[PDB]
Design a protein around this ligand. Structure first.
Ligand SMILES: [Ca+2]
Length: 123
């Protein structure tokens, strides 16, 4: 769920999870266009991951799941079902991805109007 998402992103660092609430063309509810940068790419991959989970019959934005933060690293589990495995994997992946990026203030609250209609394919 969103609580775990914010949690994992905050565990790995280096900035507040709120910094990605609405950024570029993909960080924030929905999203389309050409990713603006590395961070926007992480959100693109995350959206893709969430779509895959939804197709797997899960609820990425609501179901909670257990996990641990150790030395700024996310450890997933224990999982009670396959969905908790999937969700934690998505969040763990965007957290790691996001952790390796530089922040571009110019994309904070970027107008979706400036984002293209089409989007790159999902892996
Ligand atoms: Ca999004």
């Amino acid at each position: 769920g969103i609580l775990e998402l914010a949690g994992t992103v905050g565990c790995v660092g280096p900035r507040t999870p709120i910094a990605y609430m609405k950024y570029g063309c993909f960080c924030g509810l929905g999203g389309h266009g050409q990713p603006r940068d590395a961070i926007d790419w992480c959100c693109h991959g995350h959206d893709c991951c969430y779509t895959r989970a939804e197709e797997a019959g899960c609820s990425p934005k609501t179901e909670r799941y257990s996990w641990q933060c150790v030395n700024q690293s996310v450890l997933c589990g224990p999982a009670e079902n396959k969905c908790q495995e999937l969700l934690c994997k998505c969040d763990q992946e965007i957290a790691n991805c996001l952790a390796q990026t530089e922040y571009n203030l110019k994309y904070l609250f970027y107008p979706q109007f400036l984002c293209e209609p089409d989007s790159p394919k999902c892996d």
